[PDB]
Amino acid sequence: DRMVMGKIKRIEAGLPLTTAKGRTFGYDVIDTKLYINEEEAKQLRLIYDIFEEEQSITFLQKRLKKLGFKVRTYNRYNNWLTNDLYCGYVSYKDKVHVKGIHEPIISEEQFYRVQEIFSRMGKNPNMNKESASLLNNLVVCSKCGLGFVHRRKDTVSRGKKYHYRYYSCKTYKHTHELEKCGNKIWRADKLEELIIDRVNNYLEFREKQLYLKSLINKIYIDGEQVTIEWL
DNA sequence: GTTTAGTTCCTCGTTTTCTCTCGTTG
DNA sequence: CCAACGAGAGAAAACGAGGAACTAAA
Ligand SMILES: [Zn+2]
């Protein structure tokens, strides 16, 4: 309206639209202009580094707590890790970007590497949960178009306790929303072993998990056929 | 004996929703 | 001085792959 005139004016001048204390972490504000704060800037470089390693905010919080840092709120770290203010840009409505006059803290190369970690995260729901299967979001139903889901079935039969794992199309799981498509339900241990052998011809657990997401796009299953779509 | 499926009701990192406040320019 | 918008904070709610325990067939 009439007050958008004032906010666009600062962007053309390379100035930030956020100068409030507590909302400009890593920067001191002097006469409405930003200047690095060595105490807080050192944490940001430390935060960006660890997030690349852990590729998770919660894992980032837990490691920072072991370094004496006070753990901020979750959304606090996400905003910090996705705000291009720290590689030297000022933006109106997060879609009109201009290089600011302030000194950046994070390299422009590192910033976008982080952004691809979040991008990959969004395409893989629950990938950072303790229970995420080895192939959490990699298996797709050929006959069905829907994604397979890991399933852990344990039973007590005649006193003895058994434990079994499976990968089944989501149609077998959500019976209130989806009709079964007649696609095979594979033993988890048998399919995982099959994927391993094939990946070999082309580390801890979560190291495996992520290593697969980097060199496989999606895995297709058509009955007994496993066709890996390499990335 | 050993497996393969169903159903109910929880797990929790992540995402999204929705107020509250700050403060610069008009 | 002052109002008003965009933006960061942030508690709550919603997400969704995956679980725990129990059951009956295969
Ligand atoms: Zn299907």
Is residue A143 marked as binding? yes
Q: What is the CA radius of gyration of chain A?
A: 24
For chain A, domain boundaries: 1-123, 124-231
- A5 beta carbon to strand C: under 7 Å: no
Q: How far apart are CA A137 and CA A218, in angstroms?
A: 8
DSSP A149: E
* CA diameter of chain A: 77
Is residue A169 marked as binding? yes
Q: How far is the CA of A150 from the centre of ligand 1 (A)?
A: 13
Is residue A42 marked as binding? no
Amino acid identity, position A65: K
- Which nucleotides of strand B are protein-proximal, with an atom < 7 A from a CB? 1-7, 11-17, 22-26
Q: How far is the CA of A140 from the centre of ligand 1 (A)?
A: 8
Q: How far is the CA of A139 from the centre of ligand 1 (A)?
A: 11
Q: How far apart are CA A47 and CA A200, in angstroms?
A: 34
CATH code at A1-123: 3.90.1750.20
Structure token pair of residue A160 = 């003895």
Taken in order A120, A121, A122, A125, the sign of the CA dihedral is positive
How buried is A49 (Cβ within 10 angstroms: 0-12 exposed, 13-18 middle, 19+ buried)? middle
Contact between A26 and A18 (Cβ < 8 Å): no
The structure's method of determination equals: X-ray
Q: How far apart are CA A22 and CA A199, in angstroms?
A: 48
Angle subtended at Cα A56 by Cα A82 and Cα A133, rounded to the nearest 5 degrees: 135
DSSP A85: G
Q: How far apart are CA A216 and CA A227, in angstroms?
A: 11
Contact between A131 and A51 (Cβ < 8 Å): no
H/E element, A45? helix A38-54
Contacts of A106 (CB under 8 A, 6+ apart): A44, A45, A48, A86, A87
Structure token pair of residue A207 = 């190291």
- A70 beta carbon to strand B: under 7 Å: no
Q: How far apart are CA A57 and CA A34, in angstroms?
A: 26
A185-CA/C25-C1' distance, Å:
17
- Which nucleotides of strand C are protein-proximal, with an atom < 7 A from a CB? 3-12, 15-26
User: Cα A85 vs. chain centroid, distance in angstroms?
Assistant: 20
